[PDB]
Amino acid sequence: MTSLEKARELLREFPVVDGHNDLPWALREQVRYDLDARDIAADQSAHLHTDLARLRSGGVGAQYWSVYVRSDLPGAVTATLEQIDCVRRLIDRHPGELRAALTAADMEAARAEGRIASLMGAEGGHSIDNSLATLRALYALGVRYMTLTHNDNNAWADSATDEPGVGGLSAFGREVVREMNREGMLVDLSHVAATTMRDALDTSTAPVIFSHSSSRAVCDHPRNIPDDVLERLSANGGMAMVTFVPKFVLQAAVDWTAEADDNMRAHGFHHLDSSPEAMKVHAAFEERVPRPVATVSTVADHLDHMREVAGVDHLGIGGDYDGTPFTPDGLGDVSGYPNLIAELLDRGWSQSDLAKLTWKNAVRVLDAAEDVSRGLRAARGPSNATIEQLDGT
Ligand SMILES: CC(C)C[C@H](N)P(=O)(O)C[C@H](C)C(=O)O
Ligand SMILES: [Zn+2]
Ligand SMILES: [Zn+2]
Numbered sequence: 516m517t518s519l520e521k522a523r524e525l526l527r528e529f530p531v532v533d534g535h536n537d538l539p540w541a542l543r544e545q546v547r548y549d550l551d552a553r554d555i556a557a558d559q560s561a562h563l564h565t566d567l568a569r570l571r572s573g574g575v576g577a578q579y580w581s582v583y584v585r586s587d588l589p590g591a592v593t594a595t596l597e598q599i600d601c602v603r604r605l606i607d608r609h610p611g612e613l614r615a616a617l618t619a620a621d622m623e624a625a626r627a628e629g630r631i632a633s634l635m636g637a638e639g640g641h642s643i644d645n646s647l648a649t650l651r652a653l654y655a656l657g658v659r660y661m662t663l664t665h666n667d668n669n670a671w672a673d674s675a676t677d678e679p680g681v682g683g684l685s686a687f688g689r690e691v692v693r694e695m696n697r698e699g700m701l702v703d704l705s706h707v708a709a710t711t712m713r714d715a716l717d718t719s720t721a722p723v724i725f726s727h728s729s730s731r732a733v734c735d736h737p738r739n740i741p742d743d744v745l746e747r748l749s750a751n752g753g754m755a756m757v758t759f760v761p762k763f764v765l766q767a768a769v770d771w772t773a774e775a776d777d778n779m780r781a782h783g784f785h786h787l788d789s790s791p792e793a794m795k796v797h798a799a800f801e802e803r804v805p806r807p808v809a810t811v812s813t814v815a816d817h818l819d820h821m822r823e824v825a826g827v828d829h830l831g832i833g834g835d836y837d838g839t840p841f842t843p844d845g846l847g848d849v850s851g852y853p854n855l856i857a858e859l860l861d862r863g864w865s866q867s868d869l870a871k872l873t874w875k876n877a878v879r880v881l882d883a884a885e886d887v888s889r890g891l892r893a894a895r896g897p898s899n900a901t902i903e904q905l906d907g908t
Contacts, residue, residue: 522856523574529870530576530626531852532877534726534756534833535636535705537581538565539601541837548601556609564836564848567612570631572850576874577622577632579660579726580605581838586641586665592649595642599635599656606633617657619882626874636703636726639665640672640691645902647694659881660701660726663688663711670902673708675737683710684718686905692718694898699888701881704728704744705758705833708737712744721887722752722880727833729757729764729817732824738763745821748829752883754876755825756833757817759809761841764817767807775800809843811851815858818872827868831877 516524538555541563546552553559559566570578582598584591606613614625616632625632635658642661643649653661663672668680671688684692692715695702702723704712715723731739740755748755761768776786778800784793821830836842836849845854856869864872 518857518860519853521860522853525856525866525869526574526576526853526873529874530574531832531873532577532579532622532632533575533836533849534579534724534831534877535581535638535758535838536565536578536834536836536849537583537838538563538605538836539580539598540583541565542601543598548597548604550601550604550608555605556612560848564842566849567609567631569848569850571612573848573852574856574873575631575849575852576626577616577634577877579634579636579833581638582635582642582658583638583665583838584642586639586667586669591641592644595637595653596656599653599658602633602635602657615657617659618885619878622878622881634659636660636662636701638662638703638726639706640669640688641665643691645670645687647690647898647900650691650694650700651698651897654698654700658700659884660703660724661695662703662705662726663691663707663715665706671906673711674706675708675711676706677708679708679710681906683708683714687900687902689714689718690898690900690905695719696721696884696887697891697895697897699884701884704740706738709741709744712740716744716747716751719751720891722754722883724753724831724880725755725833727756727758727760727835727838729760729814730820730824733817733820734764734766734769736763736769740821742824745825745829748825752829752880754829754831754880755821756831756877757814757821758833758835759814759843759846760835760839761807761809761813761843764843765807765809765813768809771804771807774804806841811843811845811854811858813843814846814855815862818859819862822868827871828876828879830872832872 555566584594614630622632664674668677671685762772
């Protein structure tokens with residue numbers, strides 16, 4: 516059989532646990548959670564990367580649904596609860612296809628019955644409003660990882676896409692990591708600065724993840740992971756879940772985006788300005804310099820290097836579907852994973868290597884978080900510390 520046929524067979528046995536899909540945010544923005552208007556039991560190809568049929572075609576057996584909210588708007592906690600509610604409603608609406616999962620055992624139970632294990636991950640520490648009790652409430656509601664920052668610094672952690680702030684984690688930032696360890700919430704180091712990665716690895720007593728980051732050595736962008744950090748994963752026990760975002764994984768796309776941003780500033784616009792006038796300027800740039808396109812090969816290049824440095828036991832996949840408008844060819848939506856697995860087969864990845872990448876590493880890591888939490892919950896009570904106490908006025 517072809518590599519693609521073999522890939523599908525392999526995924527039927529050990530499906531993908533995807534680290535980060537922004538369907539909830541897409542539903543929030545497109546239709547304000549009018550789920551009938553984007554029914555994922557029907558074909559949503561015109562609007563979304565994600566629906567149930569494409570998840571099945573793609574060999575997705577578990578999904579961390581992102582409950583991302585904007586850090587640059589007020590009411591982050593309320594919005595996070597709305598995102599969590601969206602995930603709950605999707606699970607309730609589609610019991611034939613989705614099963615809520617809170618634990619590694621739940622993931623295996625879902626796999627045994629052929630339902631997609633549905634977990635939640637918060638994307639940025641702003642979702643807890645500097646409140647450890649709020650962190651505990653998110654865990655109680657089912658959140659099983661939290662990205663420590665999004666694109667901007669928060670009061671206690673530095674983002675990779677912002678200027679240096681506290682220098683990694685502040686004292687309160689370390690307290691957040693300790694509390695996540697005690698609760699059994701995975702520390703997610705996507706988005707954070709390399710300093711923050713190192714501070715988190717110093718502090719965490721549980722395996723950490725990168726829910727959607729690729730390799731900085733392969734493509735130099737602050738959203739990707741440095742080799743020295745990848746090297747620490749085997750000792751920490753965690754995993755890096757490669758992402759597909761073209762402007763992170765393809766050198767030509769990083770360069771093009773930098774030039775596009777420079778061009779915007781040349782016209783007196785902030786690079787993120789979305790006014791009609793700014794859009795005209797960007798359109799003119801793309802007219803004379805077409806947007807480069809990544810491929811499955813681009814993503815496999817990251818995985819090859821990440822495997823060499825981090826080890827096969829420390830890898831996963833986090834597509835960022837519905838979180839990015841652009842995708843590599845062959846990975847245009849959630850049905851694409853078999854194309855990546857086929858490429859890896861062609862590059863000599865073994866069946867057991869691939870089962871770790873898709874399924875086994877993610878289950879091990881969540882189980883490990885539970886194990887560390889058991890010890891910490893027996894050893895001490897929850898923290899009552901405040902950011903004022905630990906970081907000062
Ligand atoms: C505004 C919403 C769509 C942002 C997404 N939650 P994101 O996952 O942070 C996508 C981005 C390319 C990244 O991961 O850096
Ligand atoms: Zn992200
Ligand atoms: Zn996201």
